[PDB]
C-alpha cells in the first residue's frame, strides 16, 4: 500500500516470538541444527508469499572442536604434571541445561598444536602495545605464548601482530574493566560478564577474500579447492579464548616488569605485570595450550528469498544478515535474525495484499559468517556479474540491540539524507521523549560534531556482511541498531557478547523487555529497504558525499602535514587531490540542479539518471584494487592495512602515510605517497565525470 502500512504492520510480539524460537538450541554453521533452521526459514519465507526462495549451498572450509578431545589451557610444572586447568566448558545458563549442542569455548580456524612456554601480557595486543614491548619495555615476545585482552581491535589483527612478534601461542580473555559495567550484576542476575563467560570469534585476516580455499570464485560442486598451504588468511598459531575467573588465577602468578601505563591495567586483582614467567617459587611452571580443533570442508546453506520487482526487476535491493551463532545467540544474530524474519513476514503480507515493489528485493539468511564472511562472500562471488551491474544497495542487519540509549546508524553518504529523513517520521523508544521523533532524541544524545541540530552518522568500516557488497562490488551499504552510552561507558560492545549467556532471557530481562527498541530498529531497517525499493528516483544525494569528501581530504592532508619539510623536499602535493574534490563538488552541484528539474515522466531518462546515481558509488572502486588486497577495491571507505579498527578514509594514502617516518628509503616511500595521491585524485575525478553530463 505505502510506507506507513509496512511500518505499522511490524509487531513487537512477533519479533519476541521469533527470538524465542531461534534461541532454544544452538545453530552453529555447518551443523544439522543450522540446516534444519535454514529449511524452516525457507519454508516460512515461502508460505509468507516470497516470490522464489532458494537454499544456495556451498562447500566451504570451516572449523570445529572435536568432541572426544576437548580444548583447554593448563599450567604445567617442571616435572610435567598439570597444576591448573581452564574451564572445559562455560557454565550452562539457567533454563538451558538439557541441550547438548553447546560447543565449548574456542576460536575458529585455530590450527592444532600443544604449545608450551612462558606468558607475556600485551594489554589490548594492539600494534602500539607491541611497539611498547620492544622499543621501551625491551621484551622479546618471539617464542613465548602471549595473553591478550579483548577490545579496540579485531581478533584478526591481534593474532596477526602476535604472529609478527613471533608468539608461539595466543590466549584471549575479557577484562572486566572493559567488560563489566559498574553497578550491574552478572548473569543470571545481571547483564555483566560472569567469570565463566567466554567471548568467541574467528581469527581470520581474510581481507574480503571469503572462502580461504577459493578466493575470487564461488566454492561450487565442481570447484578446485586450493591446498591448505596456499590458503589465505589462515593463522599459523593456536588460539583459544577463556574467561576472566580462570584468567585471574593465571594472571596473578605472573611476575616481572611492572605495567608502563595506567591503561596497562584493569579491574581484576592483578599486578598486570608485563614480564615473562611467573615470579617466585613457581618460576618453573608455564602455560600449555590444548587445541585439537579440526578444519574440514562442510556444506553451508544461504536462504535467499527474491521478491520480484514490478517496474525494474533487474535492480536488486539486498537486505540480509547472518544466522549462525556459537551458542543460542539471543543477541547476535538471533536478535537481528528475528528482525529480518519480521520484515520478511510483513513484506509477504503486503505481497499477499497485492502490492509490488518497484525494485526486486533480495532477502538473505546468510551462513558461516561467524567463521569469516564465508557464505555472503561466496554468494556475492557467484553472482558478481549480476550484482555489480544490477544491484542498488545492501542493507545489513545484525545485533539490533546493544544497549538502550539511542540509534546508531552507519551508512554511505549517498543515503545520509535518507537516514535523516526516515528518522524524523519515526517515534522515540527511549526513556523520555514520548511522542517526539527518533531524530530529535538521536540528535540530542548523539549530536554531529559539525552541526548541533544534525545527528552523528559514522562510516561503514569493515566487518559483517556488508564488506563484500560495499568494499568489493561498490554497492551502498547501511546499518542501524540501538546503542549504549559510548560517551560514559568504556566496554566496547555489550559484556555478554559471543557466549552461552546470550540467551533469550538475557535479551528479555536485562535488555529490551517489551521488545520495543527491537521494534524501532526493525522499523528503521525495513524503512530504509522500502525507500530503496519503492522510490521513483533513487533516494541518494551526491552533494553530501562531495561535502564529506572535502572533510577527509583535509584529514588525509593533515596527517601528511605532520611532515611539512618532507612534503617540500619531495614536491609532494595534494593540489591534484584538492582540485579533484573541488571538481566533484561543482559537478555534483550541477548534477543535483539537473536532477531537481529533469523530467520524470520519461522512463528512459529516469533510468539514465537512476543509473548515474547507482553507478556513482560503483565509479569509486578500481579494478586493480588496493595493494596486496585485490578484494578491497574502494578508495574512500575500505579498511586500511594498519589501524583497520579506526577506519581512516582514503586507505591507500593512509597506509602509504602510516609510519612514514620510519622508512629505509624516504624518497621511494614519498613517491608511493604521490602515486596514491594521483590514484585517489584520478578516481575522484572519474566519479565526477561519471556524474557529468552525458554526450
Amino acid at each position: 500500500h505505502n510506507m506507513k502500512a509496512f511500518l505499522d504492520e511490524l509487531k513487537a510480539e512477533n519479533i519476541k516470538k521469533f527470538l524465542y524460537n531461534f534461541t532454544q538450541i544452538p545453530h552453529l554453521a555447518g551443523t544439522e541444527q543450522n540446516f534444519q533452521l535454514a529449511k524452516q526459514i525457507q519454508s516460512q519465507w515461502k508460505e509468507f508469499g516470497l516470490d522464489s526462495v532458494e537454499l544456495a549451498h556451498y562447500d566451504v572450509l570451516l572449523s570445529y572442536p572435536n568432541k572426544t578431545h576437548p580444548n583447554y589451557i593448563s599450567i604445567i610444572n617442571e616435572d610435567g604434571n598439570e597444576i591448573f586447568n581452564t574451564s572445559l566448558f562455560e557454565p550452562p545458563p539457567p533454563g538451558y541445561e538439557n541441550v547438548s549442542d553447546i560447543v565449548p569455548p574456542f576460536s575458529a580456524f585455530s590450527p592444532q598444536g600443544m604449545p608450551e612456554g612462558d606468558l607475556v601480557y600485551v594489554n589490548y595486543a594492539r600494534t602500539e602495545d607491541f611497539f611498547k614491548l620492544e622499543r621501551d619495555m625491551k621484551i622479546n615476545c618471539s617464542g613465548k605464548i602471549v595473553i591478550a585482552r579483548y577490545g579496540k581491535v579485531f581478533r584478526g589483527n591481534k593474532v596477526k601482530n602476535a604472529q609478527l612478534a613471533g608468539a608461539k601461542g595466543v590466549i584471549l580473555y575479557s577484562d572486566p574493566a572493559d567488560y563489566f559495567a559498574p553497578g550491574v550484576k552478572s548473569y543470571p542476575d545481571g547483564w555483566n560478564l560472569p567469570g565463566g563467560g567466554v567471548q568467541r570469534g574467528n581469527i581470520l585476516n581474510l581481507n574480503g577474500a571469503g572462502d580461504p580455499l577459493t578466493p575470487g570464485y564461488p566454492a561450487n560442486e565442481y570447484a578446485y579447492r586450493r591446498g591448505i598451504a596456499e590458503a589465505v588468511g589462515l593463522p599459523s598459531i593456536p588460539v583459544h579464548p577463556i574467561g576472566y575467573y580462570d584468567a585471574q588465577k593465571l594472571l596473578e602468578k605472573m611476575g616481572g616488569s611492572a605495567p608502563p601505563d595506567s591503561s596497562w591495567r584493569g579491574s581484576l586483582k592483578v599486578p598486570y605485570n608485563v614480564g615473562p614467567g611467573f615470579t617466585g617459587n613457581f618460576s618453573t611452571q608455564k602455560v600449555k595450550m590444548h587445541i585439537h580443533s579440526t578444519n574440514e570442508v562442510t556444506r553451508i546453506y544461504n536462504v535467499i528469498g527474491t521478491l520480484r520487482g514490478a517496474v525494474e526487476p533487474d535492480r536488486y535491493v539486498i537486505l540480509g544478515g547472518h544466522r549462525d551463532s556459537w551458542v543460542f545467540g539471543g543477541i547476535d544474530p538471533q536478535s537481528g535474525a528475528a528482525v529480518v524474519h519480521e520484515i520478511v513476514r510483513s513484506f509477504g503480507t503486503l505481497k499477499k495484499e497485492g502490492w509490488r515493489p518497484r525494485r526486486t528485493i533480495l532477502f538473505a539468511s546468510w551462513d558461516a559468517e561467524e567463521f569469516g564472511l564465508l557464505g555472503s562472500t561466496e554468494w556475492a562471488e557467484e553472482n558478481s556479474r549480476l550484482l555489480q551491474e544490477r544491484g542498488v544497495a545492501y542493507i545489513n542487519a545484525d545485533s539490533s540491540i546493544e544497549g538502550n540509549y539511542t540509534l546508531r546508524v552507519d551508512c554511505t553518504p549517498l543515503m545520509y539524507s535518507l537516514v535523516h529523513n526516515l528518522t524524523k517520521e519515526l517515534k522515540s523508544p527511549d526513556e523520555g521523549f514520548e511522542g517526539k521523533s527518533l531524530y530529535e532524541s538521536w540528535t540530542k544524545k548523539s549530536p554531529s560534531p559539525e552541526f548541533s541540530g544534525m545527528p552523528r552518522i559514522s562510516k561503514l568500516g569493515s566487518g559483517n556482511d556488508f564488506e563484500v557488497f560495499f568494499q568489493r562490488l561498490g554497492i551502498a551499504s547501511g546499518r542501524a541498531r540501538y546503542t549504549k552510552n559510548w560517551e560514559t561507558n568504556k566496554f566496547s560492545g555489550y559484556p555478554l557478547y559471543h557466549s552461552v549467556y546470550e540467551t533469550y532471557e538475557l535479551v528479555e530481562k536485562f535488555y529490551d523487555p517489551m521488545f520495543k527498541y527491537h521494534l524501532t530498529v526493525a522499523q528503521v531497517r525495513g524503512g530504509m529497504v522500502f525507500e530503496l525499493a519503492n522510490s521513483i528516483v533513487l533516494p541518494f544525494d551526491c552533494r553530501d558525499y562531495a561535502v564529506v569528501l572535502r572533510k577527509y581530504a583535509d584529514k588525509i592532508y593533515s596527517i601528511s602535514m605532520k611532515h611539512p619539510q618532507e612534503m617540500k623536499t619531495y614536491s609532494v602535493s595534494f593540489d591534484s587531490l584538492f582540485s579533484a574534490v573541488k571538481n566533484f563538488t561543482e559537478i555534483a552541484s550541477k548534477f543535483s540542479e539537473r536532477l531537481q528539474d529533469f523530467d520524470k515522466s520519461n522512463p528512459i531518462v529516469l533510468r539514465m539518471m537512476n543509473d548515474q546515481l547507482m553507478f556513482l558509488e560503483r565509479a569509486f572502486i578500481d579494478p586493480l584494487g588496493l595493494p596486496d588486497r585485490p578484494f578491497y577495491r574502494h578508495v574512500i571507505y575500505a579498511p586500511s592495512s594498519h589501524n583497520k579498527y579506526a577506519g581512516e578514509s582514503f586507505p591507500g594514502i593512509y597506509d602509504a602515510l602510516f609510519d612514514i617516518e620510519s622508512k629505509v628509503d624516504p624518497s621511494k616511500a614519498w613517491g608511493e605517497v604521490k602515486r596514491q595521491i594521483y590514484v585517489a585524485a584520478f578516481t575522484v575525478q572519474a566519479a565526477a565525470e561519471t556524474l557529468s553530463e552525458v554526450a
Partner: nanobody
Amino acid sequence: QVQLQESGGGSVQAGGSLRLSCTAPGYTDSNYYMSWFRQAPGKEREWVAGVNTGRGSTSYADSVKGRFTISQDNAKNTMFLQMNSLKPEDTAQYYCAVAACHFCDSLPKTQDEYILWGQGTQVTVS
C-alpha cells in the same frame, strides 16, 4: 615529525591577565585549525578556544565567552591566546593543537580530530 613550540602561562593571582602562545613550524602558507584545550588537575581535557585560519571565524566556550580572546601574531604560523580576569578554576594546564586544513569547512572541538599536540602549563592562585 614537527613539534609545536608553545609558551605563555605562569603563576598569576586571580583577577589578573596573562597570555598563552603556540607556534606551528612549517605552517606559514597553509590554513589550519588552531585551538586550545584545558585539562584540570585529575580531570580530562575541555574545549576553551579555537580559530579557523581558512575562514577567519573564532569560537569560544560558553563560560570562556566574554572572558578570553585569541590574538593573531604577525607570522601566519603563530597565534596567541591573551588571558584576563583569571578565575581560580583556570588553574589547570592548557594544551594547543593544530589541524591542517585546505577547505576548512568546520572547526573541530574534539581532541580526537586534532593531530599535532603540544605541552602547555599554567597555575592560577586565589
